[model samples]
Target: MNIFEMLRIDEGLRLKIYKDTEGYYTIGIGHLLTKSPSLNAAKSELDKAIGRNCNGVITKDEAEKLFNQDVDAAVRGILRNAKLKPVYDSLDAVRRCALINMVFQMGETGVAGFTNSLRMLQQKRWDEAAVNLAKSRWYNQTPNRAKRVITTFRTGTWDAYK
Candidate 1:
């Protein structure tokens, strides 16, 4: 299969603004909106990017394009600049994706707060990584989803989500 066509199978696509991993408004393949200008603030910009009312939907193509840009920024800004660059780069795709998801939820600074979890991940300590995930406020905020993510981490399989 062609690379671009198959690349975004994992990141997902959405036409509507929904809460992301950390319960903040996001849309179009995990584009986290820090401002969340649903009704005000950057109405023109938001409307321009999204639509006149921010309720207008974008196509799957648009979503993927945005995902590519966001992923680039995440990889360059979040992953590359982080102190544990080699460790992050060395992770398997799924594990790397887990970190990217966490960064999407918490941003670089926020993800950095999970020192033990990151370290466990670096060491490939699966079960301890799962427990480390549970120790966070993120787990307290979203036990079921956290369990799914943690289960995936603990077992190195995303099947728990299905």
Candidate 2:
């Protein structure tokens, strides 16, 4: 199963839309935020949880256990910040940008982990997706990807040696 399917943020979290005191709206983290009282405290608590859940930043054994089993969940959890889930749900430009950037930071396992990128993959149209994948704030994150991503993107194929 794909990571998004496993985590099922829309189903498990029932992610609602709520405007923060900052005048911006947030899709998730409502429960965690409400429970903490202070916005900063709530945000901190939520970040700690997410860091443990997906990115392995927490360093506690309990957190690490969850981190390993729920790599996808962890991905979704961290992506919650970039509006990844919301965008993934909608597949809008914002979500598209988030997908590519996250892929750079987290790898294709996160963005391409979904089927859309993979389907075009078999026909070997790697260049299109790879270029789309590389056009990110993360472009420099891996200059090498620009080469392969562009090549695979243009060609729809990936040859590790070529």
Candidate 3:
């Protein structure tokens, strides 16, 4: 989450924003974009984007760009309570990027498909987590990206920026 706060103009922040024919405010990020995200909307946009593209690798430029976008409002969608414990627990900064990247590509329902991987992450079962991450409909979806993420999880490292 802290990582997300670091997103700035050169990073993930957008300068030119406009509403679509349907009234969705679409933000411009050079060649790529989200649904007209405001500075306050970056996080949600990134989160949703990550959900839609989980496991896909990107350039350091891309990762850095995304982290700076604001996600405060997006983060509010979840309520922390004693009972639930918010499974799929928060990830390290880089891992967060990777996870969200996965979310971006896969969508929530698609990412949710990684039930065992999420649990393995919570349990700190690194190897199992990596294995589970590799076993998805998205396994070959992004061959290079998936392999890279799996390697990071397998080695217990988070160097998605590279």
Candidate 4:
């Protein structure tokens, strides 16, 4: 499956505004309205996406557009990091998607902090990389997602999608 499909499943589609696990005002497919550069800008985008003033519902097509944009941003964020570029380049499609998924959830800076895990990934030490990833607070906070991603890293396969 593509990253879009994976994220659609992981994040789930939401037509109405709701609080995320962190209590951020979120909409669409895990789009953090509160995390936008400015609340006004966020509101503007939301209004435009729904083709009206901030109401409750968002169309699937509009949500897909926003999801694609967010994924693109996450991809760029990972590739732009000099320290991550090489390791990212070395990974296969599945592992790459796993990394992108992590970046989508945690941002590049947060993933970059896993220095040892990155080093293990670079060395193609799948087991070690998975171990390092499991040792994080991120894993503790979201074990199921973390386990899926870590399994992807370990197996270098799309088994996580199954």
**Model 4 poorest ten-residue lDDT run:** 34-43
Which structure among the candidates has the greatest TM-score? 4
- Candidate 4 matches the true fold with a TM-score of 0.89
Which residue runs does candidate 1 get wrong by more than 4 Å? 1-25, 36-38, 48-56
| Cα-lDDT of candidate 3 | 0.48
| Candidate 4 collision pairs | none
Cα error, candidate 4, residue 148 (Å): 0.6
Best by the lDDT measure: 4
- What lDDT tens digits, residue by residue, belong to model 3 across residues 1-162? 233432222124343444433344444332243454453464456447556432223445554445444243223222232211253255554555455455444445556667678777767687888877877767765566677667655664544434
Q: After superposition, how far is residue 36 of candidate 3 from its true place, in Å?
A: 20
- Compared with the true structure, what per-residue lDDT tens digits does model 4 show for residues 27-134? 889887765545465676678656778665677887888898999999988879988888899989888988898889888898889999999999999888888889
RMSD of 3: 10.4
Residue-level lDDT of model 1, residues 88-129, one tens digit each, is 776776666566656654567777778888788888899888
Model 2 lDDT tens row, 48-116: 655633221232444334334445444456456443444344443322333443443344445544444
Model 2 RMSD vs true structure = 12.7
Error of 1 at 57 (Å): 4.0
Residue-pair clashes, model 1: 0
